[PDB]
Design a protein around this nucleic acid. Structure first.
Ligand SMILES: [Zn+2]
Ligand SMILES: [Zn+2]
Length: 1270
DNA sequence: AGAAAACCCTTTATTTGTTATATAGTATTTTATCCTC
DNA sequence: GAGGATAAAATACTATATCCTGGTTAAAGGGTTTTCT
RNA sequence: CCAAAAGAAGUCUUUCUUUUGGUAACCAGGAU
């Protein structure tokens, strides 16, 4: 394929490299541990920076100086040998080190599971002995020459043993003669007990010592014989002396080695087919741990069998050296250098190799040579992975060095740090402030930042306008900021979009494009109506500015990313550019009707006519300017430019409508006329007070029925009016506005008596500790509620605090009670309520103890957020990876499968009560079947968007369930289709044929984390979501039923015992160890003995594990289970996420199947393989005879599924880089470069959105009439 | 020709031995003990 | 009583949001070399 | 892509030619 790469890539292949490839990449051999000569500052020869090996340090300049001119090229100087070329080649040329002994690669020896110990069937514990010179290994044995010379040598060994034993027996006989002489001495002369006992003890001691010597020597020879007779390959001979005796006595019949060369010889004498066949037989028959070990072993053996690659690449004979420019040493001032920390590791290897090489030619004992080889083996291990075995090699300050593996792993590795995320030009950052004067598509950019980002564009116009002779003059002008650069700049930046970004970018709207304009200052001015999308308050936030350059990059920032084109949230479809806070207060104040205000309408009294009637809204604005009328007084006006409401338009104009100009009489306030003048012209007249809910309804109506530009302009006008009238609303905070409940003391005393009685009952022993606490807690909760109600009833309606609360602007009433009336019960560090409770408000001021017990829970709350901020991001990162390959590819798969939706179950007495969560499960879906009711014609046809009117029609017609299309049932091969996905929640129309729905789903699920409080053993928050998506076993696992029937329950001691009675009668299922600390489930009454249970009824109270429900009830049921369980948490936190996103993730969770019966297909039992591949392979196998493979659905987590991906590059960049790389190399995997991440890494256009062939190959041509007209 | 003050190299050794604030999850080797023949 | 098979425990590896700035970058010992007297 | 020196033309100060010269890892502290 390509060598220097021109981006004609089709594949990226990884595999093991042999020594012949390593010394084929090489341009030379490094054989001296030198880097640079400090005096001349020129690379030494045959060192780590030699110019002959790695190339010239200076462009077209050899080492000796004979050649210095460009004209010389492609020739190697005959004196210095340096090839005359460009110095850039030092980033490309590699050398190699020729090792004096073989050395293993630590990746295939250490990493668990050990892959050499699976290939050779050696436990790692004793493999470490072999490769580090701590034991011998038998590499070969002759097993027939043995048989023959073995009979012969058995005879010889018997001869030897008998001879030695006879010699020892003669020695014992001599000892016996000595004993007889001793007895002669004893009995001959006179010597009593002393001498007798002494001589006899000596004699018996000597006899026993001779016997012991005989026994020990016989045992040694017996060990020699026993070891020889049973000698086998791969046998570890510890006890050096044993091996020395064996090799001396029978040096033939076997060869034994030590170190990595022994493993090399073991691999050479290793046929890969017999091993594979044996492992397959053991799999088919063995069972138990033997089968579970053969299944693991067969993976690597099959990997090395299928491919043409050999396993000999595990043991190394040459080491490659990385080009110098990737491990540079740079001159720091003062004759000091900064090495790259790889030079030290290479120098250690070179030094050890040179010493070993010199110690071999010189001749030395085997001990010393083996010691040098062991140290050389340890040096290469440190070079490749420092610290994986033993103590890390440390540099200055006792800090471990950075090996080659460290350059690839973790957040600071090559992948995540440099390939997936980069630093870029034409950027800037600053602090953002509020830009209330801007339009929705504009931003304020300080002019010194703009002059720097747009430097090339201003330099061109300065020359083009003849303000500068050339580009250097224009550059000097821009650098010195002459007065005309500003006149050029404001023209240059016109209609050039700029990208603004705030970190963390949780969702899509964290980047948006605006139109820059110059402002005075150093802070970026941001529109107030984009802070909800950016999540940007003005307490010190900063944002980064990027600048598109090409024509496509500029069109994508105007047609795709412009701020005013993105008003709706892609997660749920709700508008995000609504008024909030001050704007809501201002709009709520304006459209309020104060009874008995200035200038109100007054009926005729009989002496004067009606008062308060105006001939136009321009006469009322003139009366409000005189103090004669109030903007919130009820009046009657004659409107001509505002469309009347539906009823008034029907009962006065009929015909077609008001047809602007026709006058009608309205009874309203001036503020409401002013508010309705801000809405479009054809919009009816809204006569209501603008609570935040009403504003949300209006802006949803406008977004549905009108284009985007109209909505953007309307929200801008609403912003202006809201700020203007919030300045005049009179909302301030003074302690005279914080009223206190008039009778707090009476309530608190009344409940103090109750608490006193409870305490006295406890003091009399009527109840234990916990019962008293529960009683006190109930009493004080009642007291808090009774104080809050009095507070609510005491405040007026025009108080600023309750006004801000009741307009929906911000805040709830619990915060008002805590500030004005009473705080109440507070929690422990454990979480249990303090029964005191706190009895003061923050207006009165808490005492010291109340403040302390309040801090108890305050800090718990702060720590919770501080620690969830990271878990949210980790979860989002995993969800983005699992589902990065779901893209809309077709328009219609034309399948008939689908899911059903609850859609307003029927009421008991008979009525259709709508299902509360219908907007997130039934809206924005397309029907799969037709809706027919009570023999009536099809109410709704197949394939319809199924919006609000259609749901209303279906409910009126009287149906409760519809079968809709879903991504869980899409029939397309790669990616979803458009009709199965349905409406796009952001656009409002059918999704496009390039949209990356997987990333949108991941960002929608994972963005509302942070605002997902962990809740006080069943998990109930972000941990619950994480364990749902990871398909873990729930903490509070609750068993489910397996078959219908009645249930017999024995309330045993220390644990329950439930057994299901099968109606069929085959077998009874027993659940033994169920803790009594749990509870029984209640469905419809607590679980009662003899009660009937369903096939999948949950018995205990808790969380069922998703794996069992899949095995019992099938895939549809587990899909329902997972979607419902995730939505339950999100609803409990009051977050609206449409179900199709969770359905995308769940679809990605259920792609594979598990192999139970291999049959004849090339699938190992227990492996997980893609379901489509499963069907294709079984189809290929039904031909050529019949032997289907048996498969079963499996459920995978978001990490296992994302690591089982078909691209080794994406999986290596996700997690576990070393393991993914080593097993990909062993399997010789090839990467097709078909995903988003893989194309991002190599720098190619992603296959999504604007980068697909349908849109990327458009052809534009003028029309013929336009050509003629010209 | 000998003595003193400034270079060049090595290496943080790895014992029959100088190293104790995480948890949560999974996966793979021991290992200990129990059950069977 | 011996062997095997299954729980148990014990180690081994992996992951934990984004952005910015400021201070440091080897010591110690042995052998040797060169200059001065 | 920039700096310095020399030569030529004009302007009273730009253009042409020749030569020379041209970073990271750790630890720590903050912010949203
Ligand atoms: Zn040369
Ligand atoms: Zn489909």
């Amino acid at each position: 394929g390509a060598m220097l790469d021109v981006n004609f890539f089709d594949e990226l292949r990884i595999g093991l490299a042999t020594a012949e490839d390593i010394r084929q990449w090489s341009y030379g051999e490094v054989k001296k541990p030198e880097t640079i000569n400090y005096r001349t500052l020129k690379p030494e020869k045959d060192g780590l920076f030699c110019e002959k090996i790695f190339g010239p340090t200076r462009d077209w300049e050899c080492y000796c100086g004979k050649y210095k001119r460009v004209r010389f090229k492609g020739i190697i100087c005959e004196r210095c040998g340096v090839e005359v070329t460009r110095a850039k080649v030092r980033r490309e040329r590699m050398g190699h080190i020729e090792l004096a002994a073989p050395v293993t690669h630590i990746w295939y020896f250490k990493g668990v599971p050990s892959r050499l110990g699976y290939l050779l069937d050696l436990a790692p514990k004793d493999l470490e002995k072999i490769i580090y010179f701590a034991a011998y290994v038998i590499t070969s044995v002759d097993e027939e020459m043995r048989h023959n010379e073995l009979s012969t040598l058995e005879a010889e060994m018997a001869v030897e043993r008998k001879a030695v034993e006879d010699q020892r027996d003669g020695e014992l006989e001599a000892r016996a003669q000595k004993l007889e002489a001793d007895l002669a001495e004893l009995e001959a002369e006179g010597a009593k007990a002393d001498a007798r006992r002494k001589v006899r003890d000596g004699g018996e001691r000597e006899m026993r010592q001779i016997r012991d010597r005989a026994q020990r020597e016989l045992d040694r020879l017996e060990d020699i014989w026993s070891t020889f007779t049973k000698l086998a390959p791969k046998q570890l001979i510890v006890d050096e002396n044993l091996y020395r005796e064996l090799v001396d006595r029978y040096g033939e019949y076997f060869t034994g080695a030590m170190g990595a060369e022994s493993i090399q010889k073991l691999i050479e004498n290793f046929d890969i087919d017999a091993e594979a066949e044996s492992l397959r037989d053991v799999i088919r028959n063995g069972k138990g741990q033997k089968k579970l070990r053969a299944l693991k072993r067969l993976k690597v053996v099959a990997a090395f069998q299928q491919s043409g690659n050999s396993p000999m690449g595990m043991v190394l004979d040459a080491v490659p050296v990385i080009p110098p420019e990737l491990r540079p040493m740079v001159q720091l001032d003062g004759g000091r250098f900064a090495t790259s920390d790889l030079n030290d590791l290479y120098r250690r290897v070179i030094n050890r190799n040179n010493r070993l090489k010199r110690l071999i030619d010189l001749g030395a004992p085997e001990i010393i040579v083996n010691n040098e080889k062991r140290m050389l083996q340890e040096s290469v291990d440190a070079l490749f992975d420092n610290g994986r075995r033993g103590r890390p090699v440390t540099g200055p300050g006792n800090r471990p060095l950075k090996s080659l593996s460290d350059l690839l792993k973790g957040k600071q590795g090559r992948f995540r740090q440099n390939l997936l995320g980069k630093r870029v030009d034409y950027s800037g950052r600053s602090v953002i402030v509020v830009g209330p004067q801007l339009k929705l598509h504009q931003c304020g950019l300080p002019k010194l930042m703009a002059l720097e980002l747009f430097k090339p564009f201003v330099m061109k116009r300065l020359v083009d306008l003849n303000h500068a002779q050339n580009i250097k003059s224009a550059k000097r002008m821009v650098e010195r900021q002459r007065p005309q650069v500003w006149d050029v700049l404001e023209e240059v930046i016109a209609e050039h979009p700029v990208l603004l970004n705030r970190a963390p970018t949780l969702h899509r709207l964290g980047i948006q494009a605006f139109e820059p304009m110059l402002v005075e200052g150093k802070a970026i001015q941001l529109h107030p109506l984009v802070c909800e999308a950016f999540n940007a308050d003005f307490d010190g936030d900063q944002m980064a500015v990027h600048l598109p350059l090409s024509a496509e990059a500029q069109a994508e920032a105007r047609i795709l990313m412009l701020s005013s084109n993105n008003i709706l949230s892609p997660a749920s479809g709700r508008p995000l550019a609504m008024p909030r806070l001050d704007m809501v207060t201002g709009l709520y104040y304006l459209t309020t009707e104060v009874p008995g205000d200035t200038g109100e309408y007054q009926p005729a009294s009989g002496d004067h006519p009606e008062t308060g009637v105006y001939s136009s809204p321009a006469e009322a604005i003139m009366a409000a300017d005189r103090g004669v009328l109030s903007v919130r007084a009820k009046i009657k006006v004659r409107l001509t430019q505002l469309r009347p409401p539906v009823e008034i338009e029907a009962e006065l104009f009929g015909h077609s409508g008001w047809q602007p100009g026709d006058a009608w009489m309205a009874e309203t306030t001036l503020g409401r006329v002013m508010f309705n003048e801000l809405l479009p012209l054809g919009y009816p007249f809204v006569n209501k007070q603008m609570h935040k809910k009403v504003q949300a309804a209006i802006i949803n109506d406008l977004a549905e029925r009108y284009p985007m530009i109209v909505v953007a302009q309307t929200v801008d006008k609403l912003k202006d009016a809201g700020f203007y009238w919030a300045t005049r609303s009179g909302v301030t905070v003074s302690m005279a506005d914080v009223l206190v409940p008039p009778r707090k003391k009476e309530i608190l005393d009344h409940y103090e008596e109750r608490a006193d009685k409870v305490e006295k009952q406890f003091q009399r022993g009527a109840l234990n500790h916990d019962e008293r606490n529960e009683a006190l807690v109930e009493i004080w909760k009642e007291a808090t509620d009774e104080v809050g109600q009095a507070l609510r009833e005491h405040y007026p309606d025009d108080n600023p605090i309750i006004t801000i609360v009741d307009s929906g602007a911000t805040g709830n009433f619990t915060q008002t009670r805590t500030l004005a009336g009473m705080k109440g019960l507070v929690t422990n560090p454990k979480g249990e309520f303090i029964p005191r409770p706190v009895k003061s408000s923050f207006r009165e001021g808490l005492t010291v103890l109340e403040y302390f017990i309040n801090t108890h829970g305050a800090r718990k709350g702060l720590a919770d957020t501080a620690l969830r901020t990271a878990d949210s991001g980790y979860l989002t990162r995993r969800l983005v990876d699992v589902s990065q390959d779901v893209i809309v590819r077709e328009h219609d798969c034309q399948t008939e499968r689908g899911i059903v939706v609850e859609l307003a179950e029927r009421a008991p007495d008979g009525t259709l009560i709508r299902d509360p969560y219908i907007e997130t499960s039934a809206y924005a879906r397309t029907l799969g079947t037709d809706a027919v009711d009570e023999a009536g014609n099809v109410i709704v046809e197949r394939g319809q968007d199924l919006g609000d009117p259609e749901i209303d029609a279906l409910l009126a017609a009287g149906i409760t369930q519809v079968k809709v299309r879903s991504v869980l049932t899409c029939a397309t091969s790669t990616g979803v289709c458009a009709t199965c996905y349905g409406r796009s929640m952001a656009t409002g129309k059918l999704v496009d044929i390039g949209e990356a729905v997987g990333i949108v789903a991941a960002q929608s699920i994972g963005e509302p984390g942070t605002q997902l409080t962990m809740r006080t053993d069943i998990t109930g928050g972000l941990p619950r979501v994480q364990e749902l998506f990871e398909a873990r076993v729930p903490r509070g696992k609750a068993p489910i039923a397996d078959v219908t029937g009645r249930v017999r329950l024995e309330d045993g001691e220390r644990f329950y015992k439930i057994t299901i009675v099968p109606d069929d009668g085959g077998e009874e299922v027993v659940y033994d160890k169920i803790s009594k600390r749990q509870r029984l489930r209640v469905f419809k009454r607590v679980l009662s003995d003899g009660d009937h249970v369903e096939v999948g009824q949950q018995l205990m109270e808790g969380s069922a594990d998703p794996h069992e429900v899949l095995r019992v009830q099938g895939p549809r049921e587990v899909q329902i289970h997972l979607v419902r369980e995730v939505q339950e948490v999100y609803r409990a936190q009051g977050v609206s996420i449409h179900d199709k996103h969770i359905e995308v993730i769940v679809r990605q969770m259920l792609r594979r199947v598990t192999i139970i019966d291999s049959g004849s297909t090339e699938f190992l039992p227990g492996s997980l393989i893609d379901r489509a591949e499963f069907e294709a392979e079984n189809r290929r196998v039904v031909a050529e005879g019949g032997e289907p493979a048996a498969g079963r659905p499996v459920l995978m987590g978001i990490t296992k599924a994302s690591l089982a991906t078909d691209s080794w590059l994406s999986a290596a960049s996700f997690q576990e880089t070393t393991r993914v790389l080593t097993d990909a190399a062993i399997n010789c995997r090839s990467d097709k470069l078909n995903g988003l991440k893989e194309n991002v890494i190599i720098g190619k256009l992603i296959p999504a959105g604007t980068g697909i062939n349908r849109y990327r190959n458009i052809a534009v041509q003028p029309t013929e009439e336009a050509r003629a007209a010209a």
